[PDB]
């Protein structure tokens, strides 16, 4: 049939990002509309702003095809960087976890060389790519994680082009997190190529979503 997508205690944010508690029955192939709660409990476990949330929340309302794929393999695409980053705020069953669709790239051997990863959308469908940018509360943690203080994150596509810089500032304490991670998303049309170049503070994507907005 075409029943609605039930999110339960989860919001669209934690659902699409891969919140460690929002990873059950969410692999549904198609749905007509989304049903959540007036005040969801599980979403962005790591505090941060979700850019273009309403736009994304409306694009994913009616979906006819929906499958996720490892756009960047964890054990294959990040040799010089550490990928096993886990946060206490995104705890799951008494264990510090992280988003399953994103990767917290940090330094390896005290070094963070600039990376350049690209992806060609050869799937004949529209791909939803999501990424984050970390903002440490102090510059001491900025150097500990990414080795550099002048970090840049450039995300360039055929229909998207934006550069990011960290705003080092001590935010209010939310879930024992005085830093922030801003979440950004874009739709990659068939044939488009998205580029990721960064030297720090990049929350790299792991699983994208090849979808098609239909009935």
């Amino acid at each position, epitope marked *: 049939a075409s029943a609605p997508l039930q999110l339960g205690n989860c919001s669209v944010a934690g659902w699409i990002l891969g919140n460690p508690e929002c990873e059950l029955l969410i692999s549904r192939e198609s749905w007509s509309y989304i049903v959540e709660k007036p005040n969801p409990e599980n979403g962005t476990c790591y505090p941060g702003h979700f850019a273009d949330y309403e736009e994304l929340r409306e694009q994913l309302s009616s979906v006819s095809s929906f499958e996720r794929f490892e756009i960047f393999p964890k054990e294959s695409s990040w040799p010089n960087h*550490t990928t*096993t*980053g*886990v*946060s*206490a705020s995104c705890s799951h069953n008494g264990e*510090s976890s992280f988003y399953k669709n994103l990767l*917290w790239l*940090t*330094g390896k*051997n*005290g*070094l*963070y060389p600039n990376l350049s990863k690209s992806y060609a959308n050869n799937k004949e469908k529209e791909v939803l790519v999501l990424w984050g940018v970390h903002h*440490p*509360p*102090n510059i*001491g*943690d900025q*150097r*500990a*994680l990414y*080795h550099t203080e002048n970090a840049y994150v450039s995300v360039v596509s055929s229909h998207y082009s934006r550069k990011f810089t960290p705003e080092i500032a*001590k935010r209010p304490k939310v879930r*024992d*997190q*005085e*830093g922030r991670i801003n979440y950004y998303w874009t739709l990659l049309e068939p044939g488009d190529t998205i580029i990721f170049e960064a030297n720090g503070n990049l929350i790299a994507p792991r699983y994208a979503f090849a979808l098609s907005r239909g009935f």
Partner: antibody
Amino acid sequence: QVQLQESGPGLVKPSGTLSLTCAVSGGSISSSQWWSWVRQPPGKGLEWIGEISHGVYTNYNPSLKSRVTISADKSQNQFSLNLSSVTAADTAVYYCARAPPYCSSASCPDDYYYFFLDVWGKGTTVTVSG
Amino acid sequence: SELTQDPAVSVALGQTVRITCQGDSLRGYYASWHQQKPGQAPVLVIYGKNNRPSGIPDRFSGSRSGNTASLTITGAQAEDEADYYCASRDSSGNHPVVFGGGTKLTVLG
């Protein structure tokens, strides 16, 4: 992989200045890691002196901050230790070691709240006698 | 904000011993354990919170219960007779490094 190697005079006159040098291969002094100095008096435990991150950032023991300077030479991949106004209580074996990066705040991955000295040097003996 | 250890402890061959290292600074950073044999440089046996480096036997294990950190040697051997120092960072000011008083482990095989 990473190998350390101390180098010093082995003998310093009292009230003098001790100068050591820890050559490092297989690693980079300029990294986010904390390249540290640790000493051990004869028949006593380990005492932490200081550390240097990147090639510029330092941190010292409050019990000896007033006479310790740790510098780094990025060109030769070496970092040195300076200790002035030395006395008989400074005679010890001096080691250089490597420490992991750490976060001062609680907003980091869990692997950034360790402290350890995985890579040590053979250590050099320094006697303050005159 | 100081680390305290037992000055000396003994264990027979094949028996289990637990070295305890207490301190208020263990509530902000994990506790490591370094082994030092006479005439040798220290060797790291525990990264922290029961994480061993490559080449360390699994009979070494760590544990933490609040302000106390414990190193456990299961089935002690003769070559485990050495000095053991705990270490971490203080959670105040510029975060200095604190070392423990040390523990002389004597194997009585």
